[PDB]
Design a protein around this ligand. Structure first.
Ligand SMILES: [Co+2]
Ligand SMILES: [Co+2]
Lengths: 472, 472
C-alpha cells in the first residue's frame, strides 16, 4: 500500500520575478523602467512574499544599455511598492561585478543597497563555495535585512542530497535567515525536489525557511514545484503568466490555481494578478527583437550543457571555421568540468568551462589555458564541489605562473575603496555618492560613458508602438 | 501524519499528438503532409502507446485548405508507421461532419476507417450524451478495433466526480475498451485529476484502462498529469517538445523526464524523440502566420469561457459596432449555458452558446434564438448534463415550431447512404469509392471543389523557405 507523506495544509508564499529574472531570462534584461512602473501598484497589492526587482544582470543592463542609474531604479521601486519585501540576487564576494572584491567594498554595497530599500538579499556563489557568500551574508545581517543563503542546484557525479543538506547547514551556520535552492537550468526533477527539500526540513527542522527558484527551460519544474510543496517548501518563485515559460519561469497564476483542493493555498489576489498580466502582455511585443526561440529543451538532462552555454560555444566554432566538431566539444565539456571539480554550469563557470573545452578540441587538450580557466584550477574563484585534477592543476600553474591557493580568495585582496573613490571622482558626470563609486568599482569600462550621458535620462532599446505597427 | 496513496511503480503509456491535435491546436490544422512524413519512421520506433494522426478537424482541413485526400493521408501514415497503433478523434454520431447521420453512414465511416488502417477510435460527444457515442462504439467493436469512449471534462455546478464515474460506467456498458478523459480547455486541476482517475479505478477496477488528454492552455495540466499517474492512469497524451505548450499540450520529453526516480517510467526512446523534436523545430517556423499569441491563460477558471470562444464573440461585437458590452456578454454566457443544461463548452456547443449569448445582450434575452440554439434546447443534439430550463425550452419551441424530443436524435434519421452515393456520383472528380461518398456526405459544400482539384496533388499554405528568408 504505497504512500507518500505530504506536508500539512498550509499557505505557500510566492515570490514574483517579473521585475527582474523574468525579463533577464526572456528578453536579455532589456526591460525599460517606464514599461514596469505601471504595474508596481498592483504588484505591491497582489500578496507576494517578496518582489524580486534588483540585482542579477539588471545593474549592468541599466548602465550599459538603458542609460539608467540602477540606484534610481531601486529607489523608485521602493517608493512605488512600499508594502512589499523587495528582493535581489547578489553573487557573493563578486557582488554584481566582474571579480571578487575586498570585504570593505562588499560592506559598502550591501549597506547602500539596504539604505536604498532592499529587504531580501539572495546571496549565492557560482561554485557553491560558502566562504564566498559568508561576508556578504554578514553585511546583510548587520544592516538588519533578510540574508538568504543560496544553493545552486546542478546534476553531477558528486552532487547528492547529502551534499545539499550539508551546504544548507553551512549556510545556516553563517546566519542565513532562509535557504534558496537555485535551479537556473531547470535541472531539478520532481523526486529530487521532494527528497532534497524534505531532507533539509528533517535535518534542520520545519522552522528552516526554504525558497525554491526553478526556471522552466526543460518543462518539468512546475511538477517539481508541486513536489517541493508536498515536501514542505515555504516559498516558490514564479513569473506573471504573460512573462513566463521557455528559459523563463513557471507562471504565477498557474502555480496559484493548481493548488485548489490540495489543502495548500497561496494568498495572491487573482484580480491584481490579472492586471499585472495584462500590463506586461501589452508591453512584451515591443521586446520581440530580444526574445528566445525555444520554449522547451530537455537536452541538458543528457548533455549537462545549458542551451546558452552550447550557443556561446557554437558561435566560437563557426567563428573558428571548424563547426564540424560541435560533437567533439560537447564530449570535451564533461571532461573539463570534471577537471575543474564539477562546478555548477552557471555564469561565469559555464563560459569558462565552455571556452576552455573549445581550445582542447583544437589547439589541443590543455595546450593553451585561458586566464579564467587557470584561475579556476588554481583556486582563485574558490573551492570546487569536488577536488580538481592535480595534474590539470599543475599545468595551470606552469601555464600562468600563479601558485595554487585554497583559502577564500578575498583574504588576499587589499583595501581598495579609497583607490576606487579617487579614480571615480575624476570622471565627468560623477555625482560624488558611494553609489557612483560602486558603479565605477563594479563596471570600470562602462561607468565613464554612463556618467557623461546619464543626464539624458533612461532610454529604451525596445521597439516603439510606431515601429510595431511598421512590422505589421 | 498526512499521506497520499499512489499507484505502484509501473510503466506509463504515452500517446503522441504531433501528427493531429498538436498542429490543429497550434497552427489551425494547416500542417502539410509533406512536412510530417519525414518524422514517421522515428515516431514509429519511439515507443508510444498510440499515434494520434487522423480525425478531428484534419479531414476538413485536408479537403478545404490543402487539396489533400484525408483517406490518402491515413493510408500513408499506416504504411510509414507499420508497427504503431494509429489513433483518431471521432465525434460520435456526428462523425467528422456537420450533423448527426443515420446509423448506416456511421457504420460505413468506421468500416472504411478500420479498413484503411485506423486502430484506436476515440469516440466522443460534445454534450457527453452516451447515446450519441453508442453506435460508433459498436461499429468500432464489429471492425475488431479499439473503442475508446470519451468523457469531455468541464467545470460546472452539475459536474462532479460521481457524475464522471457514472459516465465511465455507461461507456464501459457500451463495450468501451478504454476510457478517455478529454480536457480540451485545460480545466483539469491536479486534485480533481487524482480524485476522478482514482474513483474510476476504485469503482470499476484497476483493469479499467484510462487515457488522459489535457491541453496546456491554463498551464496547470502537467502537474495534473503527475497526479493522474499517482492515481493510476494508464496513458497520458503529449506533444513533441518543439510542438507543445500554449493552446497545445504538455511536452512528450518533459513528461517522460519528470518521472525519473518516482518509480514510474515510460518506455520512449529519447534518441528517437530528439529526432522527432528537431524535425518539427525546423519546420514549425513556416507556419508562423497561423500561430496563437498566448502561451498561458488561466482566466477560464473564473469566466468559464475558453479563449477561442471569447474571441469568436469578441469579433461578433466589434462587427456589430457595440464591443462596449464585452462584459455584458461574458456575464450572459453562464446564464445561457445554464439554460442549455451546462453542456461542456467545446465545439460546437461553445459557438452556439456564445452566439446566442450575444443576441440576448442586444436583440434581447432569447428575443431571437439561432437555429442551432433552438435545436440544443429542443434536444436535437441529445441530452444535456443537466435538465434544460423548461421556460427557455418552450420559447425555443414557439420560435422554431419544432417539438421537443428527448430520445437519441439519430433514431429519427432515415437511411441516406443511397441518396448520398447518387448525388456524389454526379460530381466531376468523384472516384466512385465509399471514401469519396463519405467525403461528400461529411462536407457537401467542399466535396465539389476538392473533387475537381484533387488531381493537382496536395498543397501547403505554409511559408516557403524562400518566403521565410524574405521576412528575415
Ligand atoms: Co533565475
Ligand atoms: Co485535444
Amino acid at each position: 500500500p504505497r504512500e507518500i507523506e505530504v506536508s500539512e495544509p498550509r499557505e505557500v508564499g510566492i515570490t514574483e520575478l517579473v521585475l527582474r529574472d523574468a525579463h533577464q531570462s526572456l528578453m536579455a534584461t532589456r526591460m525599460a523602467m517606464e514599461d514596469m512602473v505601471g504595474a508596481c501598484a498592483d504588484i505591491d497589492a497582489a500578496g507576494y512574499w517578496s518582489v524580486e526587482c534588483w540585482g542579477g544582470a539588471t545593474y549592468d543592463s541599466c548602465i550599459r544599455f538603458l542609460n539608467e542609474d540602477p540606484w534610481e531604479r531601486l529607489r523608485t521601486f521602493r517608493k512605488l511598492m512600499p508594502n512589499s519585501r523587495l528582493q535581489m540576487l547578489l553573487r557573493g564576494q563578486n557582488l554584481l561585478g566582474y571579480r571578487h572584491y575586498n570585504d570593505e567594498v562588499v560592506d559598502r554595497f550591501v549597506d547602500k543597497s539596504a539604505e536604498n530599500g532592499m529587504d531580501v538579499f539572495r546571496v549565492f556563489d557560482a561554485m557553491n563555495d560558502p566562504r564566498n557568500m559568508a561576508h556578504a551574508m554578514a553585511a546583510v545581517k548587520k544592516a538588519g535585512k533578510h540574508a538568504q543563503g543560496t544553493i545552486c542546484y546542478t546534476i553531477s557525479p558528486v552532487h547528492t542530497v547529502e551534499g545539499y543538506v550539508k551546504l544548507a547547514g553551512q549556510l545556516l551556520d553563517m546566519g542565513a535567515d532562509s535557504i534558496a535552492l537555485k535551479d537556473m537550468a531547470a535541472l531539478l526533477k520532481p523526486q529530487p525536489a521532494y527528497d532534497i527539500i524534505k531532507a533539509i526540513k528533517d535535518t534542520y527542522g520545519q522552522k528552516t525557511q526554504i525558497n525554491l527558484h526553478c526556471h522552466s527551460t526543460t518543462g518539468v519544474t512546475e511538477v517539481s514545484l508541486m513536489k517541493a510543496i508536498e515536501a514542505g517548501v515555504d516559498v516558490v518563485d514564479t513569473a506573471i503568466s504573460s512573462m513566463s515559460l521557455g528559459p523563463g519561469h513557471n507562471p504565477t497564476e498557474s502555480v496559484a490555481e493548481m493548488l485548489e483542493g490540495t489543502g495548500y493555498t497561496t494568498n495572491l489576489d487573482y484580480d491584481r494578478l490579472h492586471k499585472i498580466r495584462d500590463h506586461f502582455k501589452a508591453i512584451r511585443p515591443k521586446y520581440k527583437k530580444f526574445e528566445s526561440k525555444t520554449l522547451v529543451d530537455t537536452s541538458i538532462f543528457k548533455s549537462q550543457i545549458p542551451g546558452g552555454m552550447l550557443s556561446n560555444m557554437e558561435s566560437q566554432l563557426r567563428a573558428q571555421g571548424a563547426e564540424d566538431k560541435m560533437d567533439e566539444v560537447m564530449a570535451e565539456v564533461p571532461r573539463v568540468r570534471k577537471a575543474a571539480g564539477f562546478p555548477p554550469l552557471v555564469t561565469p563557470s559555464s563560459q569558462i568551462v565552455g571556452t576552455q573545452a573549445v581550445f582542447n578540441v583544437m589547439m589541443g587538450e590543455y595546450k593553451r589555458m585561458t586566464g579564467e580557466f587557470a584561475d579556476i584550477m588554481l583556486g582563485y574563484y574558490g573551492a570546487s564541489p569536488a577536488d580538481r585534477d592535480p595534474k590539470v592543476v599543475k599545468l595551470a600553474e606552469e601555464q600562468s605562473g600563479k601558485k595554487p591557493i585554497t583559502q577564500r580568495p578575498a583574504d588576499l585582496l587589499p583595501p581598495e575603496w579609497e583607490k576606487q573613490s579617487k579614480e571615480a571622482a575624476t570622471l565627468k558626470g560623477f555625482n560624488g555618492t558611494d553609489e557612483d563609486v560602486l558603479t565605477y568599482a563594479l563596471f570600470p569600462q562602462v561607468a565613464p560613458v554612463f556618467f557623461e550621458h546619464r543626464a539624458e535620462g533612461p532610454h529604451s532599446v525596445a521597439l516603439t508602438d510606431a515601429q510595431l505597427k511598421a512590422e505589421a
